Amino acid sequence: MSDLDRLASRAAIQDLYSDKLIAVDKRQEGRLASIWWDDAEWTIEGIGTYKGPEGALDLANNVLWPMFHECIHYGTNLRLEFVSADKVNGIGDVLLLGNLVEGNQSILIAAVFTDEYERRDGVWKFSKRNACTNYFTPLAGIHFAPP
Amino acid sequence: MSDLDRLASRAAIQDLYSDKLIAVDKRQEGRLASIWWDDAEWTIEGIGTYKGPEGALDLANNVLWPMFHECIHYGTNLRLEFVSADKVNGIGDVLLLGNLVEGNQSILIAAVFTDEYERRDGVWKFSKRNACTNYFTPLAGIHFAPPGIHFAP
Amino acid sequence: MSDLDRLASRAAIQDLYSDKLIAVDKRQEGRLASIWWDDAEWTIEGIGTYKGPEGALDLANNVLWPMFHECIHYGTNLRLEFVSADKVNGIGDVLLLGNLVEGNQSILIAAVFTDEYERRDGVWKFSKRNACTNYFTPLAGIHFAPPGIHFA
């Protein structure tokens, strides 16, 4: 049936969603580069729009990674609508915990992802991502640290 | 196979579970209403029990939305038990961060969902939801705010 | 195709992933024991390496349950790669919030799971779990409490 394809597609898209978060947190360039079409546009509001795997690597190396000593994104609430068998609009929520290099300050971030995915010759990648930051909160007098 | 049917039903119920949260957080009346049967029953301990889509809109508009400037629900750990092909029990955990209108106070809530889902005519919806809150914590000198409220005094 | 098999495998492993957490949080020995193979190795760096459904209970009853009044694990970002059709590797992230008995202290934990899963005779369980904790921080003027404790 076409349901098996749609379930295989959901699984694939949940992996792209997770990979993006994992790649950034664990600093894995290859993982990060592999999730984007060449013409894909990743936008972080307040930062800019970056195009394809190279753009993704630019943003990571030049902004995201220098910005944080370390961080963790917790991805939830991934909700897909299949426009067709081969294109999906996604929404998702993330909770980001980390330490800003600047001020060496523990923050909590809450952000919304507005995504588009596309299958091309049997393969799903991101076609678009917009990231909007709703909460950006320096945690008063707590500092995240290992045990 | 009822193996595909099981997988396909898990997906729709997952979508039910997320939709509820999104509709509350993004204040989407049409998504909120679409997920309940007429006889479905939504209870929040300490808040009350509401019935059907209209009950859901009633709670949202008159209690939830007025209570917070905004909030966000992070739903995780959805675990399903298929009672029958058209009946499932679910448990789930939620982390809620928000700002209460009363005192413009930032809160963290940890809550458990105890859910029942019902399939009528190929369509899954909530038959029941109980929301039980384990943590309810106003935050210290902490206030959740957009990134630009930084570099203000 | 056996996509269905891989899809069914993904679903069962996802339940394994969430059961470990639900069992510990809700304090459910029947759930906690049922998710491990008898040769399963569950390691939490900084603690120890326990084996099978029984060492899993040993870790629970004598270490983590006495350690917390209550806790909640939020598990996310579970990513799987299939090594064979019967064994898979997993990674996952977890956000743990809880009250330590020691000091009655509200804490936040951030941790990573490196997991292996094994299918024996049509049944998936944990072949192994590694838990590495990256943040483990007491939260200062904050105490996690039921909403009624807020009143007077």
Side-chain angles (χ1 to χ4, degrees):
Chain A
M1 262 276 271
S2 69
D3 293 322
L4 226 181
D5 180 69
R6 189 157 286 202
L7 272 304
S9 293
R10 294 172 64 85
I13 292 177
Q14 169 77 86
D15 283 345
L16 296 163
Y17 189 88
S18 285
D19 278 346
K20 147 91 166 62
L21 265 27
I22 292 152
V24 175
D25 295 340
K26 278 57 168 165
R27 298 177 187 201
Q28 288 157 185
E29 283 185 299
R31 162 130 37 197
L32 185 64
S34 72
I35 62 175
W36 311 99
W37 294 124
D38 281 6
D39 58 342
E41 308 196 332
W42 175 18
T43 302
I44 300 186
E45 282 179 30
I47 290 192
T49 296
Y50 290 78
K51 317 206 187 154
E54 259 52 58
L57 288 176
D58 181 4
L59 177 51
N61 285 294
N62 298 309
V63 188
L64 295 181
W65 295 334
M67 183 174 290
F68 286 100
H69 285 299
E70 30 30 74
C71 60
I72 200 286
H73 294 79
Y74 297 100
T76 53
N77 298 168
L78 206 225
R79 181 69 235 271
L80 307 180
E81 50 141 331
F82 285 82
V83 173
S84 74
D86 300 305
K87 59 199 274 195
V88 215
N89 299 336
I91 58 175
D93 294 298
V94 71
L95 178 65
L96 190 177
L97 302 184
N99 278 310
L100 294 168
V101 172
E102 182 102 10
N104 176 226
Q105 179 64 62
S106 287
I107 43 91
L108 176 153
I109 292 171
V112 166
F113 292 133
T114 310
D115 308 320
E116 297 178 17
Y117 310 87
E118 272 191 40
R119 199 192 345 193
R120 285 173 197 182
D121 310 310
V123 178
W124 291 98
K125 298 184 191 276
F126 276 95
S127 146
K128 206 166 261 59
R129 159 158 286 188
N130 181 264
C132 172
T133 306
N134 288 321
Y135 292 163
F136 186 95
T137 310
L139 295 172
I142 188 262
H143 183 87
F144 297 129
Chain B
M1 268 191 187
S2 67
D3 214 1
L4 181 75
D5 173 57
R6 210 84 319 165
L7 264 13
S9 291
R10 291 173 56 97
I13 295 161
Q14 277 162 40
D15 287 349
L16 287 180
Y17 185 87
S18 301
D19 285 339
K20 210 219 91 185
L21 272 13
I22 293 156
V24 162
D25 295 334
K26 279 56 161 171
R27 304 194 181 197
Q28 295 175 171
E29 283 201 328
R31 153 148 33 205
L32 186 69
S34 69
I35 59 174
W36 317 93
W37 295 122
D38 268 345
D39 49 69
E41 310 221 338
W42 182 19
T43 302
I44 295 170
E45 280 168 58
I47 292 309
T49 302
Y50 290 72
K51 82 176 87 197
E54 183 74 85
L57 279 350
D58 176 8
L59 174 54
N61 285 290
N62 300 314
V63 189
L64 297 185
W65 300 330
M67 188 176 276
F68 289 95
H69 287 298
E70 21 33 47
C71 60
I72 190 273
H73 291 79
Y74 302 103
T76 66
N77 306 155
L78 214 221
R79 179 68 226 251
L80 307 175
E81 188 198 13
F82 274 80
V83 165
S84 62
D86 298 356
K87 284 184 160 163
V88 323
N89 304 330
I91 42 169
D93 294 295
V94 66
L95 197 249
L96 175 155
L97 307 173
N99 279 309
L100 294 169
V101 171
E102 197 79 289
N104 198 25
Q105 175 70 80
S106 288
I107 40 159
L108 182 156
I109 292 162
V112 168
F113 298 134
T114 315
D115 296 331
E116 292 177 26
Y117 306 91
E118 186 168 302
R119 196 219 228 123
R120 304 175 192 180
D121 286 289
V123 178
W124 287 99
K125 303 204 186 204
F126 279 90
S127 151
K128 213 165 284 287
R129 161 152 285 184
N130 182 272
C132 172
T133 91
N134 297 315
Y135 294 152
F136 184 99
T137 324
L139 299 177
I142 297 156
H143 193 261
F144 300 124
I149 268 71
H150 206 245
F151 37 74
Chain C
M1 277 309 296
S2 60
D3 286 354
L4 226 171
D5 181 45
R6 177 170 298 201
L7 267 320
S9 281
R10 277 196 142 87
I13 293 162
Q14 180 64 251
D15 291 340
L16 288 172
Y17 191 80
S18 298
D19 277 337
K20 209 291 256 160
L21 269 22
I22 293 163
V24 177
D25 290 338
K26 275 63 175 164
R27 277 140 161 84
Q28 283 163 192
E29 297 202 24
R31 204 172 218 120
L32 185 37
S34 78
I35 59 169
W36 314 95
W37 287 122
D38 301 60
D39 49 351
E41 295 218 69
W42 170 23
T43 311
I44 300 167
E45 322 249 288
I47 303 175
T49 303
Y50 300 73
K51 288 175 189 62
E54 271 300 328
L57 271 334
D58 173 25
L59 175 48
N61 285 288
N62 306 305
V63 197
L64 312 155
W65 294 337
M67 187 187 281
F68 292 95
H69 289 289
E70 344 85 17
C71 67
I72 179 59
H73 290 67
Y74 301 102
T76 63
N77 311 157
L78 176 69
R79 169 86 226 245
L80 305 180
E81 52 154 355
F82 279 74
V83 166
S84 70
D86 290 321
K87 62 218 290 187
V88 345
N89 295 314
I91 55 174
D93 299 289
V94 60
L95 175 59
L96 189 197
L97 301 177
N99 274 317
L100 294 175
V101 182
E102 193 135 295
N104 204 17
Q105 188 46 55
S106 293
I107 61 91
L108 180 149
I109 282 166
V112 172
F113 300 126
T114 319
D115 300 323
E116 304 179 23
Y117 307 92
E118 271 213 32
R119 206 225 223 115
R120 297 173 204 174
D121 296 295
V123 172
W124 291 96
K125 279 188 194 71
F126 272 96
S127 151
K128 153 143 61 196
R129 158 153 293 188
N130 186 276
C132 174
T133 144
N134 288 318
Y135 288 160
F136 190 156
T137 55
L139 309 158
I142 288 170
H143 195 79
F144 299 127
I149 301 311
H150 172 307
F151 295 111

